[PDB]
Design a protein around this motif. Structure first.
Motif, PDB file in Angstrom:
ATOM      1  N   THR A  29     -22.509 -16.622 -43.744  1.00 33.85           N
ATOM      2  CA  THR A  29     -21.544 -17.393 -44.518  1.00 33.85           C
ATOM      3  C   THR A  29     -20.458 -16.530 -45.147  1.00 33.85           C
ATOM      4  O   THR A  29     -19.566 -17.068 -45.811  1.00 33.85           O
ATOM      5  CB  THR A  29     -22.262 -18.198 -45.606  1.00 33.85           C
ATOM      6  OG1 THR A  29     -21.460 -19.326 -45.976  1.00 33.85           O
ATOM      7  CG2 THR A  29     -22.513 -17.341 -46.834  1.00 33.85           C
ATOM      8  N   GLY A  30     -20.502 -15.215 -44.954  1.00 36.44           N
ATOM      9  CA  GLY A  30     -19.470 -14.347 -45.484  1.00 36.44           C
ATOM     10  C   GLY A  30     -19.846 -13.750 -46.822  1.00 36.44           C
ATOM     11  O   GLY A  30     -19.822 -14.441 -47.843  1.00 36.44           O
ATOM     12  N   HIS A  31     -20.194 -12.465 -46.832  1.00 33.32           N
ATOM     13  CA  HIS A  31     -20.628 -11.792 -48.048  1.00 33.32           C
ATOM     14  C   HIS A  31     -19.470 -11.180 -48.825  1.00 33.32           C
ATOM     15  O   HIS A  31     -19.344 -11.407 -50.030  1.00 33.32           O
ATOM     16  CB  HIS A  31     -21.658 -10.708 -47.708  1.00 33.32           C
ATOM     17  CG  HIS A  31     -22.680 -10.486 -48.778  1.00 33.32           C
ATOM     18  ND1 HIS A  31     -23.541 -11.475 -49.204  1.00 33.32           N
ATOM     19  CD2 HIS A  31     -22.976  -9.388 -49.513  1.00 33.32           C
ATOM     20  CE1 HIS A  31     -24.325 -10.994 -50.152  1.00 33.32           C
ATOM     21  NE2 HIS A  31     -24.003  -9.730 -50.358  1.00 33.32           N
ATOM     22  N   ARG A  66     -16.215 -11.725 -48.213  1.00 33.43           N
ATOM     23  CA  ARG A  66     -15.033 -12.574 -48.201  1.00 33.43           C
ATOM     24  C   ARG A  66     -15.118 -13.620 -49.302  1.00 33.43           C
ATOM     25  O   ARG A  66     -16.114 -14.339 -49.418  1.00 33.43           O
ATOM     26  CB  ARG A  66     -14.874 -13.264 -46.846  1.00 33.43           C
ATOM     27  CG  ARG A  66     -15.264 -12.409 -45.657  1.00 33.43           C
ATOM     28  CD  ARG A  66     -14.062 -11.688 -45.091  1.00 33.43           C
ATOM     29  NE  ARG A  66     -14.330 -11.138 -43.767  1.00 33.43           N
ATOM     30  CZ  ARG A  66     -13.634 -11.434 -42.679  1.00 33.43           C
ATOM     31  NH1 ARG A  66     -12.617 -12.278 -42.717  1.00 33.43           N
ATOM     32  NH2 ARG A  66     -13.964 -10.865 -41.524  1.00 33.43           N
ATOM     33  N   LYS A  67     -14.062 -13.704 -50.107  1.00 32.63           N
ATOM     34  CA  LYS A  67     -13.945 -14.719 -51.140  1.00 32.63           C
ATOM     35  C   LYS A  67     -12.642 -15.477 -50.942  1.00 32.63           C
ATOM     36  O   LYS A  67     -11.631 -14.910 -50.520  1.00 32.63           O
ATOM     37  CB  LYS A  67     -14.016 -14.106 -52.548  1.00 32.63           C
ATOM     38  CG  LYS A  67     -12.721 -14.135 -53.330  1.00 32.63           C
ATOM     39  CD  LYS A  67     -12.981 -13.957 -54.816  1.00 32.63           C
ATOM     40  CE  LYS A  67     -13.508 -15.231 -55.445  1.00 32.63           C
ATOM     41  NZ  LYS A  67     -13.417 -15.186 -56.928  1.00 32.63           N
ATOM     42  N   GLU A  68     -12.680 -16.769 -51.240  1.00 36.58           N
ATOM     43  CA  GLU A  68     -11.596 -17.688 -50.920  1.00 36.58           C
ATOM     44  C   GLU A  68     -10.802 -18.010 -52.180  1.00 36.58           C
ATOM     45  O   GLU A  68     -11.372 -18.452 -53.183  1.00 36.58           O
ATOM     46  CB  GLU A  68     -12.159 -18.960 -50.289  1.00 36.58           C
ATOM     47  CG  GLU A  68     -11.131 -19.897 -49.697  1.00 36.58           C
ATOM     48  CD  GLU A  68     -11.679 -21.298 -49.524  1.00 36.58           C
ATOM     49  OE1 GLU A  68     -11.476 -22.135 -50.428  1.00 36.58           O
ATOM     50  OE2 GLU A  68     -12.317 -21.563 -48.484  1.00 36.58           O
ATOM     51  N   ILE A 103      -6.316 -10.037 -47.239  1.00 31.37           N
ATOM     52  CA  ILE A 103      -6.482  -9.692 -45.831  1.00 31.37           C
ATOM     53  C   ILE A 103      -5.720 -10.671 -44.946  1.00 31.37           C
ATOM     54  O   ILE A 103      -5.905 -10.688 -43.725  1.00 31.37           O
ATOM     55  CB  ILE A 103      -7.969  -9.654 -45.433  1.00 31.37           C
ATOM     56  CG1 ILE A 103      -8.617 -11.020 -45.645  1.00 31.37           C
ATOM     57  CG2 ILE A 103      -8.707  -8.578 -46.210  1.00 31.37           C
ATOM     58  CD1 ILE A 103     -10.089 -11.054 -45.306  1.00 31.37           C
ATOM     59  N   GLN A 109      -3.706 -21.442 -42.069  1.00 28.29           N
ATOM     60  CA  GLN A 109      -4.871 -21.927 -42.820  1.00 28.29           C
ATOM     61  C   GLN A 109      -4.401 -22.176 -44.216  1.00 28.29           C
ATOM     62  O   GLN A 109      -3.601 -21.470 -44.654  1.00 28.29           O
ATOM     63  CB  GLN A 109      -6.040 -20.957 -42.696  1.00 28.29           C
ATOM     64  CG  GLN A 109      -6.254 -20.330 -41.338  1.00 28.29           C
ATOM     65  CD  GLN A 109      -7.213 -21.175 -40.558  1.00 28.29           C
ATOM     66  OE1 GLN A 109      -7.223 -21.171 -39.333  1.00 28.29           O
ATOM     67  NE2 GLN A 109      -8.004 -21.939 -41.285  1.00 28.29           N
ATOM     68  N   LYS A 129      -5.577 -21.624 -47.098  1.00 28.81           N
ATOM     69  CA  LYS A 129      -6.041 -20.828 -48.252  1.00 28.81           C
ATOM     70  C   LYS A 129      -5.855 -19.350 -48.040  1.00 28.81           C
ATOM     71  O   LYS A 129      -5.680 -18.913 -46.937  1.00 28.81           O
ATOM     72  CB  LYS A 129      -7.522 -20.982 -48.529  1.00 28.81           C
ATOM     73  CG  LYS A 129      -8.042 -22.375 -48.738  1.00 28.81           C
ATOM     74  CD  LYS A 129      -7.421 -22.985 -49.979  1.00 28.81           C
ATOM     75  CE  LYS A 129      -8.420 -23.023 -51.052  1.00 28.81           C
ATOM     76  NZ  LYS A 129      -9.580 -23.736 -50.546  1.00 28.81           N
ATOM     77  N   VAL A 154      -7.528 -15.581 -48.543  1.00 28.60           N
ATOM     78  CA  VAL A 154      -8.852 -14.979 -48.624  1.00 28.60           C
ATOM     79  C   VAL A 154      -8.710 -13.473 -48.791  1.00 28.60           C
ATOM     80  O   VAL A 154      -7.825 -12.853 -48.191  1.00 28.60           O
ATOM     81  CB  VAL A 154      -9.696 -15.319 -47.375  1.00 28.60           C
ATOM     82  CG1 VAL A 154      -8.918 -15.006 -46.124  1.00 28.60           C
ATOM     83  CG2 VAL A 154     -11.005 -14.552 -47.379  1.00 28.60           C
TER      84      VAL A 154
END
Lengths: 52, 124
Positions: free
Chosen positions: B26-28, B30-32, B67, B81, B83, B85
């Motif tokens: 689920t993505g460690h 990476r924050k949205e 990124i 996209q 958002k 991130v």
């Protein structure tokens, strides 16, 4: 079941699903009893209806 | 032209700064975020907690590094996209950081280092 929610591509986040639900039950049932008796005093001397 | 020169533009940086990161499903790292209005995002800039950039003095915030190349006016992004991130947890990145102006890099890197982000020395 439920609908998926859209997520962005680069932030690789996802969704999950809830597990199943299993339970157990039981059933009691009714009992019926009927008693009848034949005694000669209801036969001796008594007359059959419809017969002379 | 009437100035003898026309520039069509430098190419925005690509997302090659990532060298190692956690690959949890689920993505460690990476924050949205959600774009702040009228704010242009490129890969390599340090972001605060509320999606904003790190300015002078507030180097301690330094939540993540962007990124993606978000374009502010049309509210879309580098890859289409909605958002923005950034990398905010333990990962190894090239030190091609984009810092605003006045924002020293030693304090920003130290704040990111405490969060697990390591910067591999890069060279050209």
């Amino acid at each position: 079941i439920s609908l998926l929610d859209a997520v962005d591509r680069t932030s690789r986040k996802a969704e999950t699903s809830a597990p199943e639900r299993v339970r157990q039950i039981s059933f009691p049932m009714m009992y019926f009893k009927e008693v009848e008796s034949i005694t000669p005093d209801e036969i001796q001397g008594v007359r059959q209806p419809g017969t002379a | 032209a009437y100035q003898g020169f026309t520039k069509l533009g430098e190419r925005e940086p690509l997302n090659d700064i990532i060298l190692w990161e956690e690959i949890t499903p689920t993505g460690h790292s990476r924050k949205e975020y959600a774009p702040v209005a009228s704010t242009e995002y490129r890969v390599g800039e340090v972001l605060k907690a509320d999606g904003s950039k790190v300015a002078a003095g507030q180097e301690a915030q330094a939540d993540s590094v962007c990124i993606v190349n978000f374009y502010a006016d049309l509210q879309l992004s580098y890859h289409g996209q909605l958002k923005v991130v950034g990398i905010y947890r333990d990962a190894e990145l090239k030190d091609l950081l984009k810092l605003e102006s006045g924002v020293d890099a030693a304090a920003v890197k130290s704040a990111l280092k405490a969060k697990g982000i390591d910067f591999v020395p890069t060279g050209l």
